[PDB]
Design a protein around this ligand. Structure first.
Ligand SMILES: Nc1ncnc2c1ncn2[C@@H]1O[C@H](COP(=O)(O)OP(=O)(O)OP(=O)(O)O)[C@@H](O)[C@H]1O
Ligand SMILES: [Mg+2]
Length: 664
């Protein structure tokens, strides 16, 4: 029932994905690599003192601050949702092997008893209404490009000058390329305009993942992570096997001479995909104005900033349900890509642009190195894009695709289980749009706050409130899936975008507060995803440009966690035991150094200006810009800080492009 075509690097089809230059060639061939990260400047993740510190700290904090999560997954008391053993990894050393990406999720979705299209006409209207609302009255903005990002297939350029040239040219030739694809001339669109080819698969690490301590044995147990072998990936699970990867870190002593303390493991590795920049540029040109619209007009549902910004919305609710989605991106339905495209066409969007958009979501995938002596294979034929990989992480609009799917999925779940009396308001397209526009503004008795897979669903006083409690009960029971579209459950310790919803004795949203997650502080400070990259001179290009700055925003971010002071004192005590130094002092020096270094990057900042003008968001982002990709958006960051991390193509170029795409 269709195995995906697979080509070795040797094959012309794979060869054609990599330009005749060194970076691109090296990317094609890059062998499985592993090794300790430079956690902080001059400190390795596998430093014995550092692992001793992690052993003492994880044990102490779990001991003294056991999880306070009720029967309904509501966090109370100390604001703790699990043990602190997730820090116990040999950062920079992955679990083996990493998964081969599934070329088609069709069987997987079907076997999970998920819908192959909208179930009812109402759902069809709602998904189409989401498209109408999201893509309608768009205002052109400059095409902003993250500094240090790669152009991936085929050039693998990291130079901003080159990236701007690529982007400008892509906006000029997108029409020509889209038209070629309409004529089924994919190789021509790729050859001429580098629009097509494949996604480039990279494996990134999830630095902290589940670990438990067996009381019987006193031995630690790492969470098993299932991986697909090559056969399973190409057949969409029809053949091949799905098995647990190995997180055993014993191998590091024999291979590298690294002493592995007991209860320390290899890191979980997640697949990431980098899009062909020329194809992403025209998509992003539309996706950015879409974000602006939804974060402004539909700010209630979509625009999330501080813990208090969230609290203001949730306090008004009589019931708050924090939901959880089962591997969201991989399960994302291709029928939705087709629906979206169909509706954009009906809206009057340029068919050539829609084709580029459609194509971006059917593209082949080049697998790098999932394990030693494995990989270097192209899955799918770029001559006729037809993969069903779910949602690709490097697609120009992924966040919008996940947000669109999920927002409607949760609304449908609220309609089906709690608000049948609202069904009458969704009769046709104009009524579906009117209803959704109101729902998204927080104007109905059923409400939600979401960002892709993360969400909190609300009920005010009314007819639906009782249904809301029955739904919550269904979720607690966990025997029936409340959605036909995705596998939904309730979150064990409800949190929204890294803020824990801290309930009191009343267990009511009105009495509840959003607090920073202290575990996420520990994740960020001791288990960074990347090393310091002290090699990379231009700090704005690094994965962690100014690590030291995080110390300055810490109290604002984490200060409201009940155990904040206790944790910081525990850190100090444990760091003294391990290094014979003050952690606080160490961080203050790093903060001073990074504050001084920052002034070199900020035009407004005098030779020693001081963090005066900077917000806590600005600081958290400069220490970790990945937070700008999942927790915040561009508009949440100060003007001067934005310019450190991004650069844009003029609004004059985009404005002309946008006019040619959009209806009338
Ligand atoms: N630097 C980070 N620290 C913690 N969580 C992150 C970080 N970066 C991304 N995440 C998000 O956390 C995920 C794990 O699943 P889920 O969406 O419940 O997040 P989480 O445990 O709520 O994250 P956080 O630790 O910020 O609360 C990934 O899907 C990822 O997008
Ligand atoms: Mg969360």
């Amino acid at each position: 029932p269709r195995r995906a075509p697979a080509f070795p690097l040797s094959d012309i089809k794979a060869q054609m994905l990599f330009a005749n230059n060194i970076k691109a060639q090296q990317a094609s061939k890059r062998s499985f690599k592993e090794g300790a990260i430079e956690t902080y400047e001059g400190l390795l993740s596998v430093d014995p003192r550092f692992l001793s510190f992690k052993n003492e700290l994880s044990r102490y904090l779990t001991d003294h601050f056991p999880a306070n999560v009720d029967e309904y997954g509501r966090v109370y008391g100390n604001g703790v949702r699990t043990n602190f053993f997730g820090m116990r990894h040999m950062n920079g050393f992955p679990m083996i092997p990493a998964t081969w990406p599934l070329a088609s999720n069709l069987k997987k979705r079907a076997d999970a008893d998920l819908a192959d299209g909208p179930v009812s006409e109402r759902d069809n209207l709602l998904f189409r209404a989401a498209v109408r609302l999201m893509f309608s009255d768009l205002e052109p903005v400059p095409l902003k490009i993250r500094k240090g990002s790669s152009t991936c297939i085929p050039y693998f350029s990291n130079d901003m000058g080159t990236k701007i040239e690529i982007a400008e040219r892509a906006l000029e030739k997108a029409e020509e390329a889209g038209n070629l694809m309409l004529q089924g001339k994919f190789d021509d669109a790729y050859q001429l305009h580098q629009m097509g080819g494949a996604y480039y698969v990279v494996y990134r690490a999830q630095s902290t993942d589940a670990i438990t301590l067996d009381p019987k044995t006193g031995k630690f147990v790492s969470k098993d992570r299932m991986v697909a072998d090559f056969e399973y990936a190409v057949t969409g699970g029809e053949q091949g096997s799905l098995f647990a990867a190995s997180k055993d870190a014993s191998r590091l002593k024999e291979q590298y001479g690294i002493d592995v303390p007991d209860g320390f493991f290899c890191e979980r590795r997640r697949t990431a995909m980098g899009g062909p920049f020329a194809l992403n540029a025209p998509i992003m040109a539309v996706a950015q104005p879409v974000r602006n619209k939804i974060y402004s007009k539909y700010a209630y549902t979509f625009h999330h900033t501080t813990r208090l910004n969230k609290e203001e919305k949730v306090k008004e609710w009589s019931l708050c349900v924090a939901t959880d989605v089962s591997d969201h991106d991989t399960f994302w339905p291709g029928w939705l890509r087709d629906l979206i495209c169909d509706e954009l066409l009906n809206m009057g969007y340029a068919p050539w642009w829609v084709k580029l958009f459609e194509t971006s979501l059917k593209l082949p995938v080049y697998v790098g190195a999932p394990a030693p002596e494995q990989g270097h294979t192209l899955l799918g034929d770029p001559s006729n894009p037809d993969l069903e990989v779910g949602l690709s992480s490097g697609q120009g609009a992924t966040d919008l695709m996940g947000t669109l799917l999920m927002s409607i999925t949760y609304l449908v779940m609220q309609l089906d289980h709690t608000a049948p009396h609202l069904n009458s308001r969704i009769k046709d397209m104009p009524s579906a749009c009117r209803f959704l526009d109101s729902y998204w503004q927080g104007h109905e008795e059923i409400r939600q706050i979401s960002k892709s897979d993360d969400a909190m669903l609300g009920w005010t006083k009314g007819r639906a409130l009782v249904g809301g409690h029955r739904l919550f009960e269904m979720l607690k029971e966990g025997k029936v899936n409340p959605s036909p579209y995705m596998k939904i459950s309730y979150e064990h310790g409800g949190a929204f975008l890294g803020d824990i919803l801290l309930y009191d004795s009343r267990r009511e949203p009105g009495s509840a507060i959003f607090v920073g997650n202290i575990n996420s502080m520990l994740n960020n400070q001791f288990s960074p995803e990347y090393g310091v990259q002290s090699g990379v001179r231009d700090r704005s290009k690094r994965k962690r440009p100014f690590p030291g700055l995080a110390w300055a925003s810490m109290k604002d971010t984490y200060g409201a966690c009940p155990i904040y002071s206790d944790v910081l004192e525990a850190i100090e005590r444990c760091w003294w035991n391990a290094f014979g130094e003050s952690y606080r002092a160490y961080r203050e020096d790093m903060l001073k150094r990074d504050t001084l270094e920052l002034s070199r990057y900020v035009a407004s900042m005098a030779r020693q200006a001081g963090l005066a003008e900077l917000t806590p968001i600005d600081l958290e982002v400069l220490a970790d810009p990945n937070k700008l990709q999942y927790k915040w958006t561009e508009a949440d960051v100060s003007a001067n800080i934005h310019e450190v991390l991004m650069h844009g193509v003029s609004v004059e170029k985009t404005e002309r492009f946008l006019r040619s795409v959009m209806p009338r």
